[PDB]
Amino acid sequence: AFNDIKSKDATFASGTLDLSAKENSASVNLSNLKPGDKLTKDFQFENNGSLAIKEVLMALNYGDFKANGGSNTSPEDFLSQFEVTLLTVGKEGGNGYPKNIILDDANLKDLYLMSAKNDAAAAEKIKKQIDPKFLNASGKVNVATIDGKTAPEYDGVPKTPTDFDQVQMEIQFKDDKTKDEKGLMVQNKYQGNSIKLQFSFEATQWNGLTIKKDHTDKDGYVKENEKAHSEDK
């Protein structure tokens, strides 16, 4: 009836990831628009968590339709009259490519349908008129920098190399320009209409990583999780 007991110690901890997503826009809210006008919106993404981000996914949503004086009461019709002219993921950041236009004259009705409802036809049309490599199966659009040939480490706003990503979007109020036989043009129905837009950004983290001696620090913390390309094959 002889025995002995030996024990060992081991502590496990988990990291966190946060997204800043500052606006820095010129006006944020615009009113009294007329057809043919062009808008401008900016976004700045920075890392505020221990873990390293991989990409940021953009979603579009609407609400609070008013139709004060127009003859149109369908929010979808009003939203369909706004075309997003360009979406530059590079902007001021000179890492790798200075500026990159992933957009080719898209629309917002299609973007809403393929971003929230995940409609098949809208997704097909967007993929026909957008960069294929900036899309995901979920339907959202990647906005963070990707595939940096000069500096692969500056991919998906990591933390160990201090990186911030600036993106520009240009929104244009399309004019239809078709005159009726009576003499009143059809786009007159969108007079006084007001809509609210919801711009949602989702940040994801990389895949799993097999931890070895080199990846971790001298004791405790792992440094590889804070850097880009942390995931294994």
Q: For a second copy, which is the closer residue by CB, 67 or 103?
A: 67
Nearest CA to 122 out of 113, 130, 132 is that of 113
Could you say which residues in the range 144-163 bind a second copy, by CB under 8 A? Answer: none
Could you say which residues in the range 76-115 bind a second copy, by CB under 8 A? Answer: 82
* Contact between 84 and 199 (Cβ < 8 Å): no
Q: Does 220 bind a second copy (CB under 8 A)?
A: yes
Q: Does 6 bind a second copy (CB under 8 A)?
A: yes
Q: Please report how close the Cβ of residue 70 comes to a second copy at its closest, in angstroms.
A: 8
- Calpha distance 28→172 (Å, rounded): 15
Beta bridge partners of 46: 164
User: Left, alpha or beta for 95 (phi > 0: left; psi -120 to 50: alpha)?
Assistant: beta
Q: For a second copy, which is the closer residue by CB, 125 or 227?
A: 227
Nearest CA to 62 out of 74, 77, 79 is that of 79
Q: For a second copy, which is the closer residue by CB, 105 or 124?
A: 105
* Contact between 34 and 172 (Cβ < 8 Å): no
Q: Please report how close the Cβ of residue 18 comes to a second copy at its closest, in angstroms.
A: 6
Q: Please report how close the Cβ of residue 95 comes to a second copy at its closest, in angstroms.
A: 22
Nearest CA to 66 out of 196, 197, 193 is that of 193
Q: Does 137 bind a second copy (CB under 8 A)?
A: no
Q: Does 24 bind a second copy (CB under 8 A)?
A: no
Could you say which residues in the range 28-67 bind a second copy, by CB under 8 A? Answer: 28-41, 43, 50-51, 64
Rounded to the nearest 10 degrees, the angle between the axes of helix 108-115 and helix 120-128 is 120
Among 120, 121, 151, 184, binds a second copy (CB under 8 A): 184
Among 132, 133, 149, 210, binds a second copy (CB under 8 A): 210
Q: Please report how close the Cβ of residue 192 comes to a second copy at its closest, in angstroms.
A: 5
Nearest CA to 45 out of 22, 17, 18 is that of 22
Q: For a second copy, which is the closer residue by CB, 21 or 97?
A: 21
* Contact between 99 and 158 (Cβ < 8 Å): no
Q: Please report how close the Cβ of residue 187 comes to a second copy at its closest, in angstroms.
A: 4
Residue 142: φ, ψ to 5°? -70, 140
- Calpha distance 52→121 (Å, rounded): 34
Q: Does 193 bind a second copy (CB under 8 A)?
A: yes
Q: Please report how close the Cβ of residue 73 comes to a second copy at its closest, in angstroms.
A: 14
